[PDB]
Design a protein around this ligand. Structure first.
Ligand code: CHL
Ligand code: CHL
Ligand code: CHL
Ligand code: CLA
Ligand code: CLA
Ligand code: CLA
Ligand code: CLA
Ligand code: LMG
Ligand code: LUT
Ligand code: LUT
Ligand code: BCR
Lengths: 236, 37, 217, 67, 214, 51
C-alpha cells in the first residue's frame, strides 16, 4: 500500500502561502505554526530607554531626558504580578495563551449559539434581551431575578478567571491539565499530544473566524446563525 | 441618497488632500534636490 | 502517435511536406505552420506559450458562457442576465450583480470597484505567473505544477506527455467554439445554448442558412 | 529609602514601571496620522451638518427633529 | 486471552469440542469455530473473507445506528430508514435534524456524484494506502484511524478487536433483521419494537404477518 | 462624596512616599504617563459606554 496514486506528496513544512519562508521568530515548535506573522507582531520587540526628565525647580537648567540605551526585554516570563504577569505584551507565548483563550471561548460560543437557536428558536443576539427581560433556559423560567444573575455572573467569572491567572508556568497557562484533563488524553509529550494540540488550535481558529461570521451576519442580514443559513437558502 | 451638498463636501475633502499632497510633494522634491551637505 | 516524426498531422495522409522546425517534442503538434510564422525558434517558443494561455482562458470562457445559460433555462437558478453577451449589463440594474440570483452573494453595485479590483488582482496574478511569487517559483512559464498540481495527475512523465496533448486539444476546441460564440452572438442575438436548442428543434429551418446569411449580404 | 509599601501599591506597581520605554524611530506615527485625518474629516462633516453646509435627506436639523 | 487459542469459546457451546474446522485454530478475533461449510478452507480465501467480515461489520454498525437515530428523533419526523431516501424528492429536501438551512439537498444526481468521487478516493486509499497512511494493516491501519491510542497495548488491541467483531456481527445480524422486518411489517424497527413492547402476545411476527407470508 | 474626597486628600497628602510612585530603574518619583493615559482612557471609554 505504498500509495502516491491519488495525491502528490509534498516535502517541506506546510505554510500559509505555497512559496514562502517561516519568519525567524516562528521556528515551528508551537502547534499550528504555519509561518503566519505578516505584521511581525510576535517578532522580538526592540525598545529604547529615555532618561528621567529633569523636573527640579531648584536647578537652573531642567533639560529633557535622553536615550539611556537600547534594550530588548526577554519575553514569556510570567511573574507574580497579578495585574501584569508577562514581562512583555508582544511575546509569542503570551499571544498563544490569548489565541487559545480567545479560541476556546469561540468554540463554546459557536456551539452555544447554534444549540440555543435550535432549541428556543430565538436568535443568539435576540436571546440576550429576551433572557434579560425574563431569565430562562430551554423555555424554563429560572428562579432568579436578572439582577442577582448579573452579580453572580460577574462574581463567578471573576473567581474563575482569578484562579486561572494563578499559574506561573507559561506552558501550563495554556494547557493546565490536572483536573482539566481527567481522561489524560494529552498530558504527556507524545506525538499524540502534539497532534491533539494541533487539532485544538485549528478548531479554535475556525471558531474565531466563524463567530466573527455570526456577528457580522447579524449586523448585516439581521438574523442569527440558523436564520442567516435559512435566509441564504431562500435567497436563491 | 447622497445629496449634491454632500458630494461637494466629499470633493472638498478630496480637494483639500490634493492641496496638502501638492504642498508636501513640492516641499519633498525641493528638499531632496536642494539638500544640505 | 502525438509525438515524434510519426505524429499525426493536421492534413492527414495529404499532409506530405511539413515545416522542418515543426518537428515533434511538443504537445499538439500536427505539422500545421503553413504561414511559416514560427520559423524563428524564439518566436515559436513565445507562440507556444500564447497558444496555451489563450487555450486555458478559452476553456474557462467556454464553460463560463454556457453554465449560467444552462442553469437559467433548466430551472436550476434565476440569473439577472444568463446570456454571456449581456451578463456585463447586470451591474447596471436595481440590485446590482448577485451571484446565482441570490441577493446575499457578492451583491456588487459599482462597476468601477469591479474594474479596480480586477486590475489589481489580475495584475499581481499575471506578474506572479511571469516572475514567480506566493504560489511558486517559475520553472516552466506554462507548466508550473507543484502548487498548481496538488492532485498529482501529472506526476508520471508519461502521463504528463499525453495529458499536455489533451489540454491543447481540448483548449483548441474551446478556442474554436468560443470564436463561434462571438460570431453566433452577433449574427443571432440569442445565446449560444438557445441556438443549440433551435438547431435541435428544426435543423433544416433553424441554421446559419435558411436564416440570417442573406441578411448579412 | 524605598518608600512606603502597601498591598494596593504593590498590586498597582507593574502599571507604573516603564517610564522611559519607547519604540525606536517613528513607531506608529503614520498610523496615528491616519486616524487624525479621519477624525478631522469626521469633525468637518458633523460641523457641516450643524452649520447646514451639508443637507442630508433624512436629517432635518431643527427642533422638529424631536417629533 | 480467553478469546484466542484452542480453549476459546465456540459457537456450538459444549457441543463443539469434537467439531472444530482445522483451519480455525484461534489466531484471529471472533473465532468461534463456525466454519461448517467448506468456505475459507484455503488460507487465501480465508484471509480475504476475514477482511470482508470486518468491513461488512463496521458498515453494519454504522448502518444500525443510522437506521435508528433519525426514527428516534423528532424534527426528522421519525422517518423510517427504508423511507429516508425519498425525502430528497420532497419540496423541502434533506434538512439535517429537520433544521431548515442545514443541507437543503434537492438533487439526487448531485448527491450521488459527490458520493462516487469521494468514496472512490476513500476506498482506493483504503486498498492501496494514501495520505492518511501507507504500509499499514489493511483492516487495522491504526495511526490516524486510532487517534485516542485506545489499542496501543497489543493485548488490549486483541480484546478490543474481539469487541469490534462481536459488536459488528450483532449489528450485521440486526441489520438483516431491519431489512426483513421492514419488507414484512412495512414499519421502522423502532415502531416494530414499540408495538411488541405494548402487546407482545398480539404484536409479533407469528400473530400478525406469519399467516399471510404464504 | 465631598467629605470622603476630603479625607482621602489628607491621607494621600500625608502618605506621599509610596513605592508605587518611584521609578524601579532609578528609584526616583516618576509617572509612566503613556501607560497611565491608557489606563485612565480605558475607564473613560468604559464609563462612556455604560452611560
Ligand atoms: C485526411 C484529410 C484531411 C484534410 C483534407 C484535412 C484538412 C484540414 N485539417 Mg485535418 N485534415 C485531414 C485529416 C486530419 N486532420 C486531423 C487533425 C486535425 C487538427 C487537430 C486540425 C486539423 C485542421 C485541418 C484544417 C487546417 C486549416 C484549414 O482550415 O485549412 C483550410 C484553409 C482554410 C479553411 C482557410 C479559409 C478557406 C475558406 C474556404 C475561405 C484543414 C481544412 C486544423 C483545423 O482547422 O481544425 C478545425 C486543426 O487544428 N486537422 C486528423 C487526425 C490525425 C486527420 C486524419 O487523421
Ligand atoms: C446499503 C445501501 C442502500 C440501501 C440498503 C438502500 C435501500 C433503499 N433505498 Mg437507497 N439504499 C442504499 C443506498 C442509497 N440510496 C440512495 C438514494 C435513494 C433514494 C433517492 C431513494 C432510495 C430508496 C431506497 C429504498 C427503496 C424503497 C424500499 O422500501 O425498498 C426496500 C428494499 C429493500 C430493503 C431491499 C434492499 C436491501 C439490500 C440489503 C440492499 C443492498 C444494497 C447494496 C448497496 C448493494 C449495491 C450493489 C451494487 C449497486 C454496487 C430502500 C430501502 C427510496 C426510498 O427511500 O423509498 C422511500 C428512494 O426514494 N435510495 C443513495 C444515493 C444518495 C444511496 C447511496 O449509497
Ligand atoms: C485520505 C482520506 C481518507 C478519508 C476521508 C477516509 C474516510 C474513511 N475511511 Mg479510510 N479514509 C481515508 C484514508 C484511508 N483509509 C484507509 C483505511 C481504512 C480502513 C481500513 C477503514 C477506513 C474507513 C473509513 C471510513 C470510516 C472512518 C474511519 O476510518 O473512522 C475510524 C477513525 C476514527 C473514528 C471513512 C468514510 C473504515 C470504513 O470503511 O468503514 C466502513 C475502515 O474500516 N479506512 C487508508 C489506508 C490505511 C487510508 C489511506 O489514506
Ligand atoms: C460561551 C459559552 C456560552 C454562553 C456565554 C452562553 C450564554 C447563554 N446561553 Mg448557552 N449554550 C452554550 C454556551 C454558552 N451559552 C453551549 C456550549 C450550549 C450547548 C450545550 C448551550 C446551549 C444553550 C441553550 C439550549 C440555551 C442557552 C441559553 C443561554 C442564555 C441564558 C441561559 C443561561 O445561560 O443560563 C444558565 C444555564 C444553566 C445565555 C445568554 C438559553 C437561551 O438562549 O435563552 C433563550 C437556552 O435555552 N444555551
Ligand atoms: C453508513 C452510515 C450512515 C448512512 C449511510 C447514513 C445516511 C443518511 N443519514 Mg445518517 N446517521 C448515521 C449514519 C448513517 N447515515 C449515524 C451513525 C447517526 C447517529 C449520529 C446518524 C444520524 C443522522 C441524522 C440525525 C440524520 C441522518 C440523515 C441521513 C440521510 C441524509 C444525510 C444528509 O443529510 O447528508 C449527510 C449529513 C451530514 C453531512 C451531516 C452534516 C453536519 C450536521 C448537519 C451538523 C451538525 C448539526 C448542526 C450543529 C445543526 C445546527 C443547528 C442545531 C444546533 C439546532 C442519509 C440517507 C438525515 C435524514 O434526514 O435522514 C433522511 C438526518 O437528519 N443521519
Ligand atoms: C473565463 C472564466 C469566467 C469568467 C471571466 C466569468 C465571469 C462571470 N461569471 Mg462565471 N463561471 C465560470 C467562468 C467564468 N465566469 C465557470 C467555468 C463556471 C462553471 C463553474 C461559471 C459559473 C458561473 C455562475 C453560476 C455564475 C457566473 C457568474 C459570472 C459573472 C459574475 C462574476 C462574479 O461575481 O463572480 C463571483 C466571484 C467569485 C465566486 C469568487 C471566485 C472564487 C475565488 C477562487 C475566491 C461574471 C461576468 C454569475 C452571473 O452573473 O450569472 C450571469 C453566476 O451566477 N459564473
Ligand atoms: C410454496 C410456498 C409459498 C407460497 C405459495 C408463498 C406465497 C406468497 N408469499 Mg412466501 N415464503 C415462502 C413460501 C411461500 N410463499 C418461504 C419458504 C419463505 C421463507 C423464505 C417465504 C417468505 C416470504 C416473504 C418474506 C414474503 C412472502 C410473501 C408471499 C406472498 C407474495 C406477496 C407479493 O409478492 O405480492 C405483493 C407484495 C406484498 C403483499 C408486500 C409483501 C405470497 C402469497 C410476501 C408476503 O407475505 O406478502 C404479504 C412477503 O413479504 N413469502
Ligand atoms: C497628522 C500628522 C501628525 C503628526 C504628529 C507630529 C509628528 C512629528 C512630531 C515630532 C517632530 C519631531 O521629530 O521632533 C521635533 C523636530 C525634530 O527634532 C530634532 O531636529 C533635529 C534638527 O537637526 C534633528 O532632525 C533631530 O533628529 C530631531 O529629533 O523639531 C523640529 O523639526 C521643529 C519643527 C517640528 C514641526 C513638526 C511638524 C510635523 C508635521 C507633520 C509631520 C508629518 C509626518 C511625520 C512623519
Ligand atoms: C495553426 C496555424 C499555422 C499557421 O501559422 C496559420 C495560422 C492560421 C495563422 C495558424 C492558426 C491560428 C489560429 C486557428 C488561431 C485561432 C485563434 C482563436 C480563435 C483563439 C480564441 C481565443 C478565445 C478566448 C481566449 C476566449 C476567452 C473567453 C473569455 C475570457 C470569456 C469571458 C466571459 C465569461 C466566461 C462569461 C461572461 O458572461 C462574459 C465574459 C466575462 C466575457
Ligand atoms: C460463519 C459461517 C460458516 C459456515 O462455513 C458458512 C456460513 C454458515 C454461510 C457462514 C455464515 C455467514 C453469515 C451468517 C453471513 C451473514 C452476513 C450478513 C447478514 C451481513 C449483513 C450486512 C449488512 C450491512 C453491511 C448493512 C449495511 C447498512 C447500511 C450501511 C445503512 C445504510 C443507511 C442508513 C444508516 C440509514 C438510511 O435511512 C438508509 C441507508 C442509506 C440505507
Ligand atoms: C465669586 C465668583 C467666582 C468664584 C466662584 C467659586 C470658585 C466659588 C467656590 C465654590 C466652592 C469650592 C464651594 C465649596 C463647597 C464645599 C462644601 C460646602 C463642603 C461640604 C462638606 C461637608 C458639609 C462635610 C462633609 C463630611 C466630612 C468632611 C467627613 C465625612 C463626613 C461628612 C461627609 C459629613 C466666579 C468664578 C463664579 C466668577 C464670578 C465671582
Amino acid at each position: 500500500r505504498s500509495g502516491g496514486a491519488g495525491y502528490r506528496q509534498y516535502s517541506g513544512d506546510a505554510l500559509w502561502l505555497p512559496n514562502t519562508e517561516r519568519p525567524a521568530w516562528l521556528d515551528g515548535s508551537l502547534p499550528g505554526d504555519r509561518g503566519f506573522d505578516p505584521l511581525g507582531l510576535s517578532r522580538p520587540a526592540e525598545y529604547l530607554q529615555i532618561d528621567l526628565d529633569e523636573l527640579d525647580q531648584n536647578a537652573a537648567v531642567n533639560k529633557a531626558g535622553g536615550v539611556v540605551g537600547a534594550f530588548t526585554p526577554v519575553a514569556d516570563q510570567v511573574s507574580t504580578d497579578s495585574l501584569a504577569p508577562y514581562s512583555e505584551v508582544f511575546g509569542l507565548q503570551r499571544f498563544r495563551e490569548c489565541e487559545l483563550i480567545h479560541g476556546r471561548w469561540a468554540m463554546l460560543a459557536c456551539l452555544g449559539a447554534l444549540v440555543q437557536e435550535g432549541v428556543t428558536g430565538d436568535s443568539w443576539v435576540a436571546a440576550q434581551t429576551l433572557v434579560y427581560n425574563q431569565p430562562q433556559y430551554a423555555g424554563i423560567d429560572l428562579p432568579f431575578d436578572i439582577y442577582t444573575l448579573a452579580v453572580l455572573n460577574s462574581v463567578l467569572m471573576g473567581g474563575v478567571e482569578l484562579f486561572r491567572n494563578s499559574e506561573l508556568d507559561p506552558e501550563r497557562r495554556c494547557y493546565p491539565g490536572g483536573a482539566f484533563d481527567p481522561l489524560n488524553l494529552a498530558s504527556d509529550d507524545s506525538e499524540r499530544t502534539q497532534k491533539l494540540r494541533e487539532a485544538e488550535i485549528k478548531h479554535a481558529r475556525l471558531a474565531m473566524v466563524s463567530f466573527l461570521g455570526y456577528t457580522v451576519q447579524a449586523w448585516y442580514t439581521g438574523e442569527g446563525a440558523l436564520g442567516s443559513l435559512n435566509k441564504f437558502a431562500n435567497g436563491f | 441618497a447622497a445629496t449634491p451638498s454632500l458630494n461637494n463636501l466629499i470633493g472638498s475633502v478630496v480637494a483639500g488632500g490634493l492641496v496638502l499632497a501638492a504642498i508636501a510633494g513640492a516641499i519633498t522634491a525641493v528638499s531632496n534636490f536642494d539638500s544640505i551637505r | 502517435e502525438f509525438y515524434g516524426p510519426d505524429r499525426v498531422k493536421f492534413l492527414g495522409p495529404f499532409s506530405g511536406n511539413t515545416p522542418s522546425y515543426l518537428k515533434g517534442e511538443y504537445p499538439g503538434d500536427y505539422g500545421w505552420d503553413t504561414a511559416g510564422l514560427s520559423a524563428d525558434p524564439e518566436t515559436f517558443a513565445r507562440y507556444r506559450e500564447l497558444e496555451v494561455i489563450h487555450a486555458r482562458w478559452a476553456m474557462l470562457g467556454a464553460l463560463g458562457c454556457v453554465t449560467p445559460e444552462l442553469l437559467q433555462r433548466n430551472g436550476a437558478a434565476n440569473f439577472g442576465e444568463a446570456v454571456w453577451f449581456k451578463a456585463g449589463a447586470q451591474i447596471f440594474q436595481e440590485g446590482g450583480l448577485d451571484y446565482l440570483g441570490n441577493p446575499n452573494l457578492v451583491h456588487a453595485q459599482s462597476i468601477v470597484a469591479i474594474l479596480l479590483t480586477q486590475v489589481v488582482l489580475m495584475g499581481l496574478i499575471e506578474g506572479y505567473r511571469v516572475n514567480g511569487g506566493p504560489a511558486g517559483e517559475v520553472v516552466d512559464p506554462i507548466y508550473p505544477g507543484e502548487a498548481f498540481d496538488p492532485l498529482g495527475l501529472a506526476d508520471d512523465p508519461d502521463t504528463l506527455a499525453e495529458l499536455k496533448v489533451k489540454e491543447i486539444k481540448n483548449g483548441r476546441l474551446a478556442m474554436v467554439s468560443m470564436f463561434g460564440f462571438f460570431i453566433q452572438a452577433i449574427v443571432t442575438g440569442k445565446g449560444p445554448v438557445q441556438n443549440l436548442s433551435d438547431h435541435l428543434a428544426s435543423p433544416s429551418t433553424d441554421n446559419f442558412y435558411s436564416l440570417y446569411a442573406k441578411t448579412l449580404a | 529609602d524605598t518608600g512606603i509599601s502597601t498591598p494596593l501599591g504593590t498590586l498597582l506597581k507593574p502599571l507604573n514601571s516603564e517610564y522611559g520605554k519607547v519604540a525606536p524611530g517613528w513607531g506608529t506615527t503614520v498610523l496615528m496620522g491616519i486616524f487624525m485625518a479621519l477624525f478631522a474629516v469626521f469633525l468637518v462633516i458633523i460641523l457641516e451638518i450643524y452649520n447646514s453646509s451639508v443637507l442630508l435627506d433624512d436629517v432635518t436639523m431643527s427642533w422638529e427633529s424631536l417629533a | 486471552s480467553q478469546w484466542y487459542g484452542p480453549d476459546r469459546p465456540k459457537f456450538l457451546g459444549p457441543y463443539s469440542t469434537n467439531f472444530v474446522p482445522s483451519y480455525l485454530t484461534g489466531e484471529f478475533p471472533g473465532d468461534y469455530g463456525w466454519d461448517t461449510s467448506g468456505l475459507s478452507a484455503d488460507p487465501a480465501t480465508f484471509a480475504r473473507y476475514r477482511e470482508i467480515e470486518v468491513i461488512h461489520a463496521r458498515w453494519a454498525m454504522l448502518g444500525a445506528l443510522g437506521c435508528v437515530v433519525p426514527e428516534l428523533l423528532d424534527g426528522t419526523n421519525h422517518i423510517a430508514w427504508f423511507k429516508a431516501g425519498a425525502e430528497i424528492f420532497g419540496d423541502d429536501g434533506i434538512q439535517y435534524l429537520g433544521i431548515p438551512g442545514l443541507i437543503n439537498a434537492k438533487s439526487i444526481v448531485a448527491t450521488l456524484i459527490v458520493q462516487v468521487v469521494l468514496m472512490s478516493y476513500v476506498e482506493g486509499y483504503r486498498v492501496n494506502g494514501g495520505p492518511a497512511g501507507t504500509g499499514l494493516d489493511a483492516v487495522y491501519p491504526g495511526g490516524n484511524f486510532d487517534p485516542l491510542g485506545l489499542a496501543d497495548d497489543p493485548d488490549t488491541l486483541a480484546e478490543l478487536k474481539v469487541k469490534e467483531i462481536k459488536n459488528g456481527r450483532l449489528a450485521m445480524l440486526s441489520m438483516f433483521g431491519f431489512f426483513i422486518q421492514a419488507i414484512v411489517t412495512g414499519e421502522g424497527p423502532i415502531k416494530n419494537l414499540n408495538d411488541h413492547l405494548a402487546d407482545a402476545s398480539a404484536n409479533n411476527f407469528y400473530a400478525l404477518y406469519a399467516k399471510n407470508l404464504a | 462624596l465631598s467629605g470622603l474626597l476630603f479625607a482621602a486628600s489628607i491621607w494621600h497628602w500625608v502618605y506621599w512616599d509610596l513605592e508605587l510612585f518611584r521609578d524601579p530603574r532609578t528609584s526616583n518619583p516618576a509617572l509612566d504617563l503613556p501607560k497611565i493615559f491608557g489606563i485612565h482612557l480605558f475607564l473613560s471609554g468604559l464609563l462612556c459606554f455604560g452611560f
